[PDB]
Design an enzyme around this catalytic site. Structure first.
Site, PDB file in Angstrom:
ATOM      1  CG  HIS A   1      -0.452   0.376   2.540  1.00  0.00           C
ATOM      2  ND1 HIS A   1      -0.394  -0.577   3.429  1.00  0.00           N
ATOM      3  CD2 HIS A   1       0.109   1.452   3.013  1.00  0.00           C
ATOM      4  CE1 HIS A   1       0.035  -0.064   4.659  1.00  0.00           C
ATOM      5  NE2 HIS A   1       0.165   1.016   4.374  1.00  0.00           N
TER       6      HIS A   1
ATOM      7  CB  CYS B   1       3.234   0.475   7.309  1.00  0.00           C
ATOM      8  SG  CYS B   1       1.518   0.400   7.740  1.00  0.00           S
TER       9      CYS B   1
ATOM     10  N   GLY C   1       3.242   5.889   9.914  1.00  0.00           N
ATOM     11  CA  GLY C   1       4.651   5.675   9.582  1.00  0.00           C
ATOM     12  C   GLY C   1       5.269   4.348  10.215  1.00  0.00           C
TER      13      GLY C   1
HETATM   14  C1  LIG Z   1       0.958   2.381   7.826  1.00  0.00           C
HETATM   15  O1  LIG Z   1       2.024   2.796   8.523  1.00  0.00           O
HETATM   16  C2  LIG Z   1       0.028   2.662   8.700  1.00  0.00           C
HETATM   17  C3  LIG Z   1       0.005   2.190   9.995  1.00  0.00           C
HETATM   18  C4  LIG Z   1      -1.136   2.490  11.043  1.00  0.00           C
HETATM   19  C5  LIG Z   1      -1.368   4.180  11.012  1.00  0.00           C
HETATM   20  C6  LIG Z   1      -1.943   4.300  12.603  1.00  0.00           C
HETATM   21  N1  LIG Z   1      -1.371   2.628  13.218  1.00  0.00           N
HETATM   22  C7  LIG Z   1      -1.147   1.934  12.330  1.00  0.00           C
HETATM   23  O2  LIG Z   1      -0.880   0.905  12.614  1.00  0.00           O
HETATM   24  N2  LIG Z   1      -1.405   1.803   8.189  1.00  0.00           N
HETATM   25  C8  LIG Z   1      -2.234   2.387   7.221  1.00  0.00           C
HETATM   26  O3  LIG Z   1      -2.279   3.734   7.549  1.00  0.00           O
HETATM   27  C9  LIG Z   1      -3.201   1.711   6.771  1.00  0.00           C
HETATM   28  C10 LIG Z   1      -3.260   1.728   5.334  1.00  0.00           C
HETATM   29  C11 LIG Z   1      -4.525   2.469   4.825  1.00  0.00           C
HETATM   30  C12 LIG Z   1      -5.276   2.677   6.131  1.00  0.00           C
HETATM   31  N3  LIG Z   1      -4.670   2.077   7.265  1.00  0.00           N
HETATM   32  C13 LIG Z   1      -5.028   1.896   8.537  1.00  0.00           C
HETATM   33  O4  LIG Z   1      -4.304   1.271   9.357  1.00  0.00           O
HETATM   34  C14 LIG Z   1      -6.263   2.533   8.879  1.00  0.00           C
HETATM   35  N4  LIG Z   1      -7.316   1.594   9.471  1.00  0.00           N
HETATM   36  C15 LIG Z   1      -8.307   1.200   8.661  1.00  0.00           C
HETATM   37  O5  LIG Z   1      -8.929   2.121   7.576  1.00  0.00           O
HETATM   38  C16 LIG Z   1      -9.068   0.134   9.163  1.00  0.00           C
HETATM   39  C17 LIG Z   1      -8.591  -1.427   8.752  1.00  0.00           C
HETATM   40  C18 LIG Z   1      -9.438  -2.283   8.775  1.00  0.00           C
HETATM   41  C19 LIG Z   1      -7.991  -1.101   7.423  1.00  0.00           C
HETATM   42  C20 LIG Z   1      -6.146   3.894   9.717  1.00  0.00           C
HETATM   43  C21 LIG Z   1      -5.915   3.253  11.289  1.00  0.00           C
HETATM   44  C22 LIG Z   1      -5.155   4.872   9.409  1.00  0.00           C
HETATM   45  C23 LIG Z   1      -7.492   4.721  10.048  1.00  0.00           C
HETATM   46  C24 LIG Z   1      -4.244   1.042   4.529  1.00  0.00           C
HETATM   47  C25 LIG Z   1      -4.117   0.642   2.857  1.00  0.00           C
HETATM   48  C26 LIG Z   1      -5.350  -0.058   5.159  1.00  0.00           C
END
Ligand SMILES: *[C@H](O)[C@H](C[C@@H]1CCNC1=O)NC(=O)[C@@H]1[C@@H]2[C@H](CN1C(=O)[C@@H](NC(=O)CC(C)C)C(C)(C)C)C2(C)C
Ligand SMILES: *[C@H](O)[C@H](C[C@@H]1CCNC1=O)NC(=O)[C@@H]1[C@@H]2[C@H](CN1C(=O)[C@@H](NC(=O)CC(C)C)C(C)(C)C)C2(C)C
EC number: 3.4.19.12
Lengths: 306, 306
Positions: free
Chosen positions: A41, A145, A143
């Site tokens: 992603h 990820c 950040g």
């Molecule tokens: C990547 O570093 C990041 C790590 C997240 C941010 C906050 N805590 C974490 O673990 N991941 C993402 O931003 C992730 C990518 C976009 C939306 N992402 C999320 O984790 C969302 N979560 C959701 O939308 C719900 C789940 C079911 C996906 C949030 C936390 C940013 C709202 C990807 C492509 C899923």
């Protein structure tokens, strides 16, 4: 003595962490030999992550769209390909710090160490268990990820986890290093629910054995119980059923302490039915379930890695 | 989100750990530039450790009595001297992996990461606080002496702890890297008692702020209390008195959450007087006191090190 939630030394993994930037997304990658692994992603925009088609998205990318930084030194991308939910970026340098390693997929109930990372720079290390619902209770901000989870067995790092996302409950979801998600999750920014969790029964028993090894004995008793009648208590308190192979793996701990596995189950039964009455076990007022039988034996015996 | 007990990445310290053997004693040493630091009780026999005179013991030693191993490579000792309760063994090689470092003595209430080590090989990493009674609740077996505790601030390792010994209660005692013990302990195998502990009040409040940042709010209230009247509750439950400088250091967390420090004290008061009634805070059924205001801000904001 003492019993702490203890991670593996992180040095071997720290040497593999890099920064991956594409467009306006930056995350961490894992640099082994001449490949950098990172969550796919990273190719997405903010309005790509809402409902992406990753094959369409990746064919529009080129090597030069991927900025890879190993500290203050830029790595040159010379190839890219997608394996399930991870990207594999082939770079023009092999990591001279590449440990001996394996990619392993773990079972729920098993534990691993997480090296939380931001901008390619390691931030902290801590222990996690894979929950029965394939989530992990981690500590992850924007950040993070591409931070990985791992175990170390002598000199070899077994990578088991790459971080992708946080669910609405505040738990975390990700993939093995082949890009296959743990659990029924997709790397899509839509609502997804974790599935109902359970307590890892064999792990609680291992932790009770760690407590006895460390001198907490107040919860012991001379009662016993059949495996069958323990499990009727287990389903009642949302604990996992116990199998004979769990009894077998608890054998060595049973032997060191002289407390039969089924005797310790009778103790757990009583703790479930009465609580603790203002007492603690290894400094916890809860029954702890993120220590495996292996974890107990390592800490209460003292294995190392080189 | 998430909140975990999180240690610093250990790589920089792993590169400094060596094995020190004298006679029939083996322990860990810390190799920085051309000096190896280790606990001075390595010069002792089993019946030396009962009531040793270390100056007498060390004048009878020579350089060649000290076997120093950096993995599978032997270091040659070319000098030895004693600084308080540590030995400084001058070797013929400078450690090429010497990080930028400092020797710092910490205050009770402060936290650090411990790299537990056996035979010069790192085994695990975990977080510890210096208790108000100058002990630490660690995880240490035979041969762990010379493992160090540390913090990392950008690229610089601040060493604060070297492990020496375990008290009868199962807690641990040691020194700063200048060889001065934390607390009223001596490196002598006789009975020594830890002194009565207290709970680190400002740390509990910081952890409550971490909980609010993470969405646990059930313990909040619209009551308040004066600093004076909070401390009458504190002494009653063996908590440390709170000072205005503790209120000041909690300022930023107070600001982010919008919960006045004195409001959070009123909440802590109620948790002390009523307990939790079957609820948890950040996955704990106890009030946690080994997170500093700094620890909360790092984890709930995301600082790194390089
Ligand atoms: C990547 O570093 C990041 C790590 C997240 C941010 C906050 N805590 C974490 O673990 N991941 C993402 O931003 C992730 C990518 C976009 C939306 N992402 C999320 O984790 C969302 N979560 C959701 O939308 C719900 C789940 C079911 C996906 C949030 C936390 C940013 C709202 C990807 C492509 C899923
Ligand atoms: C050094 O690796 C070792 C680490 C101990 C072993 C078990 N857990 C630990 O932390 N230290 C010592 O062996 C220490 C040296 C001899 C006796 N030592 C002890 O820690 C004693 N403890 C006591 O005698 C009581 C305190 C007040 C000293 C035990 C645990 C081995 C009985 C030195 C010189 C103190």
């Amino acid at each position: 003595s003492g019993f702490r939630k203890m991670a593996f030394p992180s040095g071997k993994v720290e040497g593999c962490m890099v920064q991956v930037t594409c467009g306006t997304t930056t995350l961490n990658g894992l640099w082994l030999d001449d490949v950098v692994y990172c969550p796919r992603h990273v190719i997405c925009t903010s309005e790509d992550m809402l409902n992406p088609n990753y094959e369409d998205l990746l064919i529009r990318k080129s090597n030069h769209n991927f900025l890879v930084q190993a500290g203050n030194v830029q790595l040159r991308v010379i190839g890219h390909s997608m394996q399930n939910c991870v990207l594999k970026l082939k770079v023009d340098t092999a990591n001279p710090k590449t440990p001996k390693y394996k990619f392993v997929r773990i079972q729920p109930g098993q534990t691993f160490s997480v090296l939380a990372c931001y901008n390619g720079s390691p931030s902290g290390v801590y222990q996690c268990a894979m929950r029965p619902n394939f989530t992990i209770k981690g500590s992850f901000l924007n950040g993070s990820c591409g931070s990985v989870g791992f175990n170390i067995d002598y000199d070899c790092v077994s990578f088991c986890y790459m971080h992708h996302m946080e669910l609405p409950t505040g738990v975390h979801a990700g993939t093995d290093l082949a890009g296959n998600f743990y659990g029924p999750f997709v790397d899509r920014q839509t609502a997804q629910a974790a599935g109902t969790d359970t307590t890892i029964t064999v792990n609680v028993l291992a932790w009770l054995y760690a407590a006895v090894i460390n001198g907490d004995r107040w919860f012991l008793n001379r009662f016993t119980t059949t495996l069958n009648d323990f499990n009727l208590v287990a389903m009642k308190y949302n604990y996992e059923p116990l199998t004979q192979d769990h009894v077998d793996i608890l054998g060595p701990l049973s032997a060191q302490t002289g407390i039969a596995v089924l005797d310790m189950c009778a103790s757990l039964k009583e703790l479930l039915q009465n609580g603790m009455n203002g007492r603690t076990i290894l400094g916890s007022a809860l029954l702890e379930d993120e220590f495996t039988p292996f974890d107990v034996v390592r800490q209460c015996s003292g294995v190392t890695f080189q």
